[PDB]
Amino acid sequence: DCHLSDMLQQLHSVNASKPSERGLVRQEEAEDPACIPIFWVSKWVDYSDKYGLGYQLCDNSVGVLFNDSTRLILYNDGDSLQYIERDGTESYLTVSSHPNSLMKKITLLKYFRNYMSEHLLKAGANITPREGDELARLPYLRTWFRTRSAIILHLSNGSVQINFFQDHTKLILCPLMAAVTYIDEKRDFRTYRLSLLEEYGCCKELASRLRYARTMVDKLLSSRSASNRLKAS
């Protein structure tokens, strides 16, 4: 069991209950703005052909998941770097003092940073994130994939974000809060506790997106299971 299997349980329970078919859908009663996330992906660039997936988190930190499965994260101080090897070791470096071996990758991260700053909007620019406590470290991108309709971004804090290309709607799912934040086409946002959606129901729009979210989470879980099987030999 992991963040993903907990999320799948949460989504299965709300979805099984057919929330848009409740006698009186009381979607507003399920809102819990206190559970807004601490982190989400505000910008991304898919350079996966050659290099990796670059992204900005809502605190203005940036990171990259490189094709060789290493990661580089740059804090919103603009100088502190965290590098993660394939096998998980974190090294703490800085833009000003770092091993020359990482020149190429640090240069790539700067390219993403600068590209995103020049060209891309900040998702959830109108959202004040939740304040994280002692242990709420900067997460990084655990894995991601794209479908015809969406990009799916899974962070190391357990959150799963799904951004829909067609209509710019977004979901941010957190298995710790057991909550979902939905950003609609007007960029209005609401956060819901999943158990309250099961209790009170919701509109067809949100219900459909939660069905898609479950499908995506099953995909993440199967990949995770596969890589764990390989890892355990």
């Binding site: 910008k43 991304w44 660039v45 898919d46 350079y47 590209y115 060209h119 891309l120 909007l121 998702a123 990009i151 951004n163 710019h168």
Partner: peptide, 5 residues
């Protein structure tokens, strides 16, 4: 290949 511009 990128988020909203």
């Amino acid at each position: 290949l990128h988020s909203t511009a």
